[PDB]
Amino acid sequence: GMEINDHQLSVAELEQKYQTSATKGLSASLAAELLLRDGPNALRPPRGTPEYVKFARQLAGGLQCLMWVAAAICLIAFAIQASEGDLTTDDNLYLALALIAVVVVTGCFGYYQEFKSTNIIASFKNLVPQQATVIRDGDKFQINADQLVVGDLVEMKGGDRVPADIRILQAQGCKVDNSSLTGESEPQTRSPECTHESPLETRNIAFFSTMCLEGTAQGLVVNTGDRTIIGRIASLASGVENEKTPIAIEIEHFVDIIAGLAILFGATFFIVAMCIGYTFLRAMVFFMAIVVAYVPEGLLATVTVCLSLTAKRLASKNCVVKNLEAVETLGSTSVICSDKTGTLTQNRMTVSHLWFDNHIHSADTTEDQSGQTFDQSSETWRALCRVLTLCNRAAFKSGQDAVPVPKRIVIGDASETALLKFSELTLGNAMGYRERFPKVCEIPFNSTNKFQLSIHTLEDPRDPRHVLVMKGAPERVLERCSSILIKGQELPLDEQWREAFQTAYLSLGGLGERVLGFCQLYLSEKDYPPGYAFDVEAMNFPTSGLCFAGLVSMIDPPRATVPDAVLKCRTAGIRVIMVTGDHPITAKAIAASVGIISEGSETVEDIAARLRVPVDQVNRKDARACVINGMQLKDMDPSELVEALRTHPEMVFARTSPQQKLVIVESCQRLGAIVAVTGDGVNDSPALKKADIGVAMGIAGSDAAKNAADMILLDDNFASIVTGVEQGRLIFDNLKKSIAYTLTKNIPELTPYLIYITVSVPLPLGCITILFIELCTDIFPSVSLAYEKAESDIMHLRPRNPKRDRLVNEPLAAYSYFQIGAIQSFAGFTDYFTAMAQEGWFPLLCVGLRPQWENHHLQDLQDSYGQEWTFGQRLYQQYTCYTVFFISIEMCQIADVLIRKTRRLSAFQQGFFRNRILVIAIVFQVCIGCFLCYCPGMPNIFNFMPIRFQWWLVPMPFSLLIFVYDEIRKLGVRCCPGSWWDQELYY
Amino acid sequence: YCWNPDTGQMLGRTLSRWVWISLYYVAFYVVMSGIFALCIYVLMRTIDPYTPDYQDQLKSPGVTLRPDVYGEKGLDISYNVSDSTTWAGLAHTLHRFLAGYSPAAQEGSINCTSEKYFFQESFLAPNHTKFSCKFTADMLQNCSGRPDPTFGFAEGKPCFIIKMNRIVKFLPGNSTAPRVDCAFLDQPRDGPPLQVEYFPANGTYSLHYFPYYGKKAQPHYSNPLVAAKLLNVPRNRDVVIVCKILAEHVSFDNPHDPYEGKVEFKLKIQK
Ligand SMILES: CC(C)CCC[C@@H](C)[C@H]1CC[C@H]2[C@@H]3CC=C4C[C@@H](O)CC[C@]4(C)[C@H]3CC[C@]12C
Ligand SMILES: *[C@@H]1O[C@H](CO)[C@@H](O)[C@H](O)[C@H]1NC(C)=O
Ligand SMILES: *[C@@H]1O[C@H](CO)[C@@H](O)[C@H](O)[C@H]1NC(C)=O
Ligand SMILES: [K+]
Ligand SMILES: [K+]
Ligand SMILES: [K+]
Ligand SMILES: [Mg+2]
């Protein structure tokens, strides 16, 4: 079922399977029957839901389904009192359009968090060829790709990309680029032979969008459109369950807590309201006023704004997000699955070791040449360097003198590419040293030869000799060598040297690297004059008994900042997994090189050999590490996969289908994981989508990855991931300090209306001045905590448990609401009663006064000095309790923001003004509060009165209180982490 | 979604923790309640009994008229001079209003014949308070229920009662006793000015009624009244009559406060 099995079948079983011919192609008719059976050969573009219906849910939710009903209580309270002629209650038209403005701006504060939103299947139609070259009715012509059908007989040639999933029948020196399948850009030969059980390995299958590099081929289309291998890759990319992000679930958690809490409070006092005697057309205008008081309107704002002041900080260190939800995901991530090629690596074949002086010297594999150089004073070495430099046909292009040797562009294959660059580093110039020794002859690397060979005259005028240089497949370089350089001498090749060489070329062969022999020989002037008639195809020169000069080996080396980055993340408790398509034995070596595997860790295939015991006998548990190939995984249950992921802590997967990357990534997510994925290639996209954060490499990234990723490291500096963890743990711990500041004030916003409903005292805090506390004065101070530095060394902490530790947990809410908010309500009501008592109305008088207070028809209400008070003289003072409770709150939202600086330290033992942005928010909190208070026009427009200076002082012991109540608590958990003071009153 | 059962085993923790936390939280809660009450007890220990600290919403007093039959957006007094059971709901609301103004409900006050600020600084009256000055029914003379216990209402020239809003220590001035003067707001181009006649003479309020020293210092003190005998208002027309108080320390130019020194009332005298 869709399993490409056509590589196994014969030529005869094929014209039966597609009713076709082997040299004629299909019949012109049948090429349409299949097209009108299977549709065209292209990629079905999956539209998401439209661009405006993702504005439609952004206006719904737990805080958004309430602020629709309170603007529907405000336009059914500007509607039952405007048909009756009551122009005075445009306090509910001013209160309907400002709440729907809180619906849509907060709706714009959740939609403008999608920067790109680019279609992923945008970049799957750009790796594809426009036209093919087919045969039908035995005539060769040129056709559109989207006209190829299952059974079409196509011709490939190098330079064009492959136009279908095509089983090859004949092919002449044909090679492809299967990075898009393996992530590996090393040519893969193809042939009519069925060289594997899997069609992903065998050579008689060529895949849609694979760039055919060199040669020709003819074969039959076997899969089409989305049925091709690269098409299956696209179906998993777009077609991923868009699970909410970590913070999204946490956002929706406390929304559901507050959405439940706002519906208890207001709707047990609607039962109270009708049952202590208000009518229904009053009792419905208490829920509305309670919910505006309890719900923090501009909370959702302060959240997303905070996320931006991280994202910018991320961008400035060249890490750009694509939606704000990602900016935190790293700090909550437990597991990182990474591609190897051009993710941790440089995807650039480069030199690593060179066997000479019967000992393996370690070369310097870094993109900036930082690390450990090797032994270059050996006279036996400076010959080995003379052979590889000369015997090299690659070349730098003109005009790259300001380019780093690694990042230069070289003509030829990656082998000579590596050596040439290495030659440009140890030597000053690799090209000039090849011209002082001009070349007279050559044989390039052939395959009947299975080596390379060239012969040159010398730079020395006094030396007239001829020097032969050669390189080839290490074993074959030995059996045409009879002498050897050890430390400066030359020695015969006994059976003790033909054993110490077959040691090293198999030693580094366990590090999984390309190995190359090297050898030389100086042709004497007595049988080869300094102008001698060298004739190549005649083959008069000896081509044996040459002086071996030393192996060299090369590998796909890691990036400069990767092995330190990896160590930092496991030091943050994070488990790291290699997930690659590369061959197993390069992978394992790379994993220990970057530090996915730690010094001393063993496979079951490392143990069994040190004990000399077969592998089935090994106890699995013993192994610190394990390695699993593409076949093995497919042979596994997932039941066996978890037992494995459990059993061995350091894991390496390799030769993996892009299909299988995802499996692993979600097979972790099922165990409750927050999963990051870093990647660069077309193989990587589906596990970049499904990952709770996907990261792609900015430069070396293939587009399909980049358009699937949520984060983009522009500079590929992988150690950026560590900075994003730091700022995702920081933002996580810096969001719950801001929320508590925003949430504690919701209690002194609420308690007035409750009292005002029951005790029938005047309204202490009006819905207008509440909306200014929430939507202005305490916006800046709420956000300024996004600039707190950690209290514990955050990178030594394990990553949080994503079930247990939450953003708004039950203890934080209760402490801000019930305790801090109580003191904030007990300053606010201490100020409400001094302003009432110093201006005419004593305490008991307030009880039951509201009905006489809120009366247009009574312009004479005699107070507690008998003084008669007009309705405007009374409502002017109702504004002087709007504006005196309001400032009792603002005085407690300074001591708040200073005890929302620290969760474990004292503000004493770190400091008070260490955050400089915080102390700039406080002076704005204060000075928008005086602007509203004192500015002319404020009493009538915004309902704000120029209060007396003693009414700022009344809530000041209450603020000095709030600070030191939290102070004693912060020390209290320090000196005793165990006892009841820690386990119940911490947040 | 399946089935969503409750969380009865959600005693979030154990019944010893909940007695532990609860008696903590209320130990917090009541401590504050006694600190908050300690404050309002210190608050009601700084206050002064006869004089308010600040009158921040009492610069110019309000002014209020009787009979008070309201409609939407203002005072409206639209009756029937002939028909007698639609001015008996305005004639009785002026009477029962004055049922605390008679010489017997004025048994507490003393006659002031000073006609200047009634300045008192120590307490001589029955039960240690300051003295007041009478205001009686008959002083509105023809608009007091005698000789007119329908208050000019049958004769198309009724008698409203303009009532000031007394204020503690409030000095309106002492060069003159401040008067009433009720006239149209829109002077009609074909009609005449609202010719009107006040009780007692000039429509003033005597200077011996002030200063007010609280409802504790002059307990039985009564506001002085006036009664404008409105003559002109033509029959079957809707006019607007503004009843101001002109004075030294009084204004009537507050566009947010329509009952501050002036009281605007629609009036219709049908036939
Ligand atoms: C002061 C008087 C009048 C009210 C007392 C009501 C009691 C039953 C209320 C008031 C405060 C409430 C507590 C406030 C905070 C928390 C912490 C939270 O993690 C669980 C619920 C819990 C523990 C609440 C339980 C019920 C509670 C104790
Ligand atoms: C106080 O004096 C008044 C005199 O007006 C008297 O009527 C009243 O009964 C007295 N009350 C007390 C408690 O002495
Ligand atoms: C008015 O009052 C002042 C009090 O400051 C007083 O000195 C003055 O004599 C009075 N003048 C008149 C005309 O009553
Ligand atoms: K609010
Ligand atoms: K690539
Ligand atoms: K994702
Ligand atoms: Mg790659």
Residue numbers in the entry:
A (entry chain A): 47 to 1033
B (entry chain B): 20 to 290
The authors write:
The highly acidic environment (pH 1) in the stomach is generated by the gastric proton pump, H+,K+-ATPase, which mediates an exchange of H+ and K+ across the parietal cell membrane that is coupled with ATP hydrolysis. The H+,K+-ATPase consists of two subunits. The α-subunit is composed of 10 transmembrane (TM) helices, in which the cation-binding sites are located, and three cytoplasmic domains (the nucleotide (N), phosphorylation (P) and actuator (A) domains) that catalyze ATP hydrolysis and the auto-phosphorylation reaction.
The β-subunit ectodomain in protomer A, and the A- and N-domains in protomer B show relatively weak density, due to lack of tight crystal packing at these regions. The N-terminal tail of the β-subunit is partially visible in the wild-type structure, in contrast to that in the Tyr799Trp structure. We could only assign an additional nine amino acids (Tyr20–Gln28 of the β-subunit) for this region that extends along with the membrane surface. However, the well-ordered regions, especially for the TM helices that define the luminal-closed K+-occluded state, are almost identical to those of the high-resolution Tyr799Trp structure. At the cation-binding site of the wild-type, a single Rb+ anomalous peak is found at the position close to the bound K+ in Tyr799Trp, as well as at site II in Na+,K+-ATPase. An anomalous signal is hardly seen at the position corresponding to the cation-binding site I in Na+,K+-ATPase, even at the low contour level. These observations allow us to assert that the conclusions extracted for the Tyr799Trp mutant in regard to K+ stoichiometry can be extended to the wild-type protein.
